[PDB]
Symmetry: D2
Subunit: 341 residues, 4 copies
């Protein structure tokens, strides 16, 4: 029964490598539940969090991680949505007010009163996590913790981004960047009746793309994505930008078909110059997309449950976390790194 104490990679300074330190096990107060983390995925956003890469930096000291999945250990008072033992996941969208303009219209994702797991509230880089039962993800029974962990963020984000491009079955989607989110985006696009064109700067990643269903591949370092896509398919109906690069964005605009949509999911910093003439005359749409809604999450989880999407995960230990992060900043990760516990 509850260790009363757990280990967790905590962040005390922006840029200062985390430190595994046995800390207290939270207690499920009213409207809360405790989750024993079985697996926990490592998202690129975890780096941006402990690296104070964004305007609203994470209050220190925090525990990152929003791809934490496990069993409901304890149940706070009033909790109806989940019971003890339930296999659940705690995503980026920790909570939302539930009654504002966006929450009432199905866009809780844009709620200004939201909390974010592993950023403004402690996450899954620990053995236990406190979660809001109403925003937690109900996992499919037929998939192991290590496998669905990625869906908790890379999965929903990519799935929702694809919905945001509005590309219909039989059409093309150009996926810029086949990394953590990218290799899983190829699978969702596939399952959504879309022809996939994969763009990256590493042949290994491009190879994985073909294994996953991509019928067109382009190494942006060996050839121009823009004219390759425009020449071979006439422009993609939808474009999903995963790349964190600077040039990737401009090439995404250029790879788009007339009247097509470029869905932005990557979070690079700063303003990006965009061709006025091209966007207006070609009637291009640029859509910003953040993770997913609870409905999006459940839908994204269903695809995994149907076996239509399998994340390419590589195991990792909680203490080797710093090595793992440095590996992602260097882009030396092939797929998604899910922490075992």
């Amino acid at each position: 029964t509850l260790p009363q104490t757990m280990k967790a990679a905590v962040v005390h300074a922006y840029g200062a490598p985390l430190r595994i330190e046995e800390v207290k096990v939270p207690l499920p107060g009213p409207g809360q539940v405790l989750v024993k983390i079985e697996a926990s995925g490592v998202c690129h956003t975890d780096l941006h969090a402990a690296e104070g890469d964004w305007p609203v930096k994470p209050p220190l000291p925090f525990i990152p991680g929003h791809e934490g999945v496990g069993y409901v250990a304890a149940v706070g008072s009033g909790v109806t949505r989940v019971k003890e033992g339930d296999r659940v996941g705690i995503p980026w969208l920790y909570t939302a007010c539930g009654c504002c303009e966006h929450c009432l219209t199905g866009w809780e994702t844009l709620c200004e009163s939201q909390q974010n797991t592993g950023y403004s509230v402690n996450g899954g880089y620990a053995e236990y996590v406190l979660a809001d039962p109403n925003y937690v993800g109900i996992l499919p029974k037929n998939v192991e913790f290590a496998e669905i962990a990625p869906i908790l963020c890379a999965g929903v984000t990519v799935y929702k981004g694809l919905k945001q491009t509005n590309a219909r079955p039989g059409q093309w989607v150009a996926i810029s960047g086949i990394g953590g989110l990218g290799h899983v985006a190829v699978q969702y696009a596939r399952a959504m009746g879309l022809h996939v064109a994969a763009i990256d700067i590493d042949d290994a990643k491009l190879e994985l793309a073909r294994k996953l269903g991509a019928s067109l591949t382009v190494n942006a370092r060996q050839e121009d994505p823009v004219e390759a896509i425009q020449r071979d398919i006439g422009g993609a109906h939808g474009v999903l930008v995963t790349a964190v690069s600077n040039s990737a964005f401009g090439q995404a605009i250029g790879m788009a078909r007339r009247g097509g949509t470029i869905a932005l999911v990557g979070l690079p910093p700063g303003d990006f110059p965009t061709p006025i003439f091209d966007v207006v005359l070609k009637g291009l749409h640029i859509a910003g997309s953040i993770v997913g809604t609870r409905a999006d999450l459940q839908e994204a989880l269903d695809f995994a449950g149907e076996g239509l999407v399998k994340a390419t995960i590589h195991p990792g230990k909680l203490d080797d976390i710093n090595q793992i992060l440095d590996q992602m900043r260097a882009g030396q990760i092939e797929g998604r790194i899910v922490l075992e516990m």
Copy 2:
């Protein structure tokens, strides 16, 4: 009995003054008609064309003008849509192929085989204009030439742009740039049940907006437009950028509410900045819109026929086109200047 010769304003060199000269009156070939210009609107696009601001420039020399309105004076063989004496207008979209992806799906506007009146084909800065009967606008009988001229471009464009915004009745739309396009957008926006926030850089232009239905008025030369819209209404559900300013485009994006849509219609040369991080986290949509479809055009014209939209025009003479364009360069025009032949 058709002059055989006519006066027209010609652009022979970029940046150079136009020259009023005598040119041969064209004869309607098989699928064409000759329109006798009665009124002709001056659009800022004519400035960009005469100045050679865009990536794709208008071959020289040429006669500008895509807000030309008048009577069908002669009909070529095989023409069926209109007949001699019909009151008709020749807009930016001169023709389209009629059988490509875009043309078949209600987006002839994105057709790659289109021609543009007063740019790639001669336009209305003349006494007569050749035209494709199939793309000409059919004018409402109760509105006078000079008054409906602006709807051939400023009206359709702005109307389709407001539709691309997806703002529904009761919602707010921030319109940046209250000129030829903008002053008419205020009217279409009101007729569409929207609350209007107008942004410009001249108090006289904001007063025109107020007179036309704008509830909130902001002068960007006196205060920060972004914090003004964000402070006074919390951001607009829809934003329509008409302004010939790259920075105005960046500010426009900052005027949107979470989940809002920014329709880009202005064509200043160069690039505009996309704050990816903000666009993503706020779930913003940016949409480039080009003039309007034939269906869009007739719908736009109907609003004018209903008296719901009335362009603010000022008469002009073909011989004074250089000083008129100078007046536009200096932003000294209230609404639109419409040439009368």
Copy 3:
């Protein structure tokens, strides 16, 4: 402080006239609030409730009324959305689970776990009402209780139904039945940029329609609505069916323009024969619409607050309720009857 006892028109038998009987004043338990009813509208659905007109009949004995508006008298424990004294309204949608397929996607209105005010839970035909703070309507400060009461049901229902027809500004909407919901539907349609065609079987009601903005009127008892609408406007883009009649439905289908949408809001019983050939070949859409979502309710309330919609209300006393109901079953009501208290 709380009367501890209140009067209320209760229903003890389906068909057996209600009876005003001083009963206990409910106490706001956790997650609840008490509302002192200042005004309470009488909806046609109240008859269907005490007349066991529907499959799932109201548990007896109940207090009908879902257009009850007043002040928040008491606040249960945990309540955050509303404070004591707040002017609020309790609509048809009493509560919903908040985490099901429909609730997560913005359609709480279709929640199978919902409760309905004045049907499955006591309503506003009393001096006080227990409500769920999260589904109650936040009223606009500038409108008196007697006036916004109708919006709590007739308003939102009609507003949402109009949205469901998808008729865009500048287009036509045929409103079949200008009664409780109908006369307020003419105002919303008006405020939504729609041209209104009013259909009824009473000239008095049709007269009110013209006063409210209808530009086309038809007494279905004096002339055929179908050919009148088809001849005068070519078919309405949208049709909103308020009538409880049998023939009204078939005429609504016939009054629709090709590709148009007939939005059903009226709740007559039984199956209605529909022309297969006409619906298929004319690409007609039939949309069932129930009251509104919390977002729809707030949006509908905003129109009243802007003064764009004014319900035509007639005062009534709680004890004269039976007379009032018999008056509605006979169709002798001109507008909406709001109970004073």
Copy 4:
């Protein structure tokens, strides 16, 4: 060198057997082409036409067939879209005006000035057919005549119907009637990422559906289809009714999930029942869909070109058309019977 005479199956009286007779081979007038029929699909619409089941009947005598496929044999003057030797098909939508509300908005399908192949104009139950080059389907080069014939109607229709359903990848669609249209709808539905529940009245037809991708199979002659779909999947997000049965239409509506859409494509004569109360409370949408647009047709054909859809066909001879239609009357056809000239 063009026979000058050809064999064709003619309908001279409703209900009476067709007569194979010699008729003059038409000559392409100005905007026409002559197509030499190589394969011709038998559609149930041909039965309704020969039987005179519809409100608007086909003038007698006439040659049915709107799934006629072949080579352009002769071109009239002014024809530009196709040229001699092109593999092309003549569908139900023979021509349209090209400039009305519907034609200009991507809905030429609803054009009031259209003509229908094998109904108001002679069709493919012959060796040659006159056609309007602008509405003919352009066949993929890698698919054989007999195999693509059904896409000219069964395929496009069913494909556009599934789109009208609005069911997105991962969702369920219940397809009622697995015949010519239905067996091909199962394939388009799968290619669109949908889970398929097939309903028919013959086990052999359900087995065909299973082989083509259906997950749930229901025989309406053995069990209540409605409670079966409602029990096994809780209702389908989308429903597509192909069945030549009025009651099947009522049952189809009962197969939808709350908020679901039922696309009506079948054309049995008479009316279908709309349970208004259920449609309203469940927020259901009923949509009538007619064949498909030229854009729809090319998209439908592309799926076939991609090998994602393959019609199950059986060869037939023009001389055996009466026995073939008898076979259809008795529901003894597996998929489609395609005549080979």
